[model samples]
Target: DLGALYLSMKDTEKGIKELNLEKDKKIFNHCFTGNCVIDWLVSNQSVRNRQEGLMIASSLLNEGYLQPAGDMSKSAVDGTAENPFLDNPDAFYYF
Candidate 1:
């Protein structure tokens, strides 16, 4: 699931590391689900605490919220795809 791959970071840092981010370094964000995405941002400290990522995700699942699936289309810039989440299928509450 592509939603499984989105966390807040500068567009350049989207997939910089493996999925397991134990700490909130450089203030990244991911698991952009429905209401959880909002709660993560509204918490004020969510960015600094990576644990919120899973909390939000779990809440989303347990709450019956969903992340949609799509084709993950992208326009290659320079030479590679950028912001794979944008315009892609799994980016719920996303464009």
Candidate 2:
């Protein structure tokens, strides 16, 4: 997951540590699903508190909301891949 990767990288320094404290526990419960990570990430103080709003913007960017996937398609010719969720805006919306 890009979000996890991003978090790990950013926190790798700055005295932050990633610990697998529970040796017997093995379950990943994401706060968001079906593209709802956007809302969850935006609402959370932990993720949002660090980046100063960049997290939400990056999530939106990654999910293809800020830039249309079709626009990214043109860049694919050079190597970029079109976002899988480009046309699935409703997947990340709230009522």
Task: Return the TM-score for candidate 1, rounded to 2 decimals.
Answer: 0.25
Colliding residue pairs in candidate 1: 6-30, 7-29, 7-30, 8-29, 8-30, 70-89
Query: lDDT: which candidate is best?
Result: 2
- The alpha-carbon deviation from the true structure for residue 8 of candidate 1, after best TM-score superposition, in angstroms, is 19
Expressed as tens digits, the lDDT of each residue in 1-95 for candidate 1 is 32443334214443222233124463223333334443444454444454555454444333433333223322322245332223222443321
Counted clashes in each candidate structure: 6, 0
Q: Where is the poorest 10-residue window by lDDT in model 1?
A: 69-78
- For model 2, residues 16-53, the per-residue Cα lDDT tens digits are 23233222453222211223333334455435542433
| Residue 60 in model 1: lDDT | 39
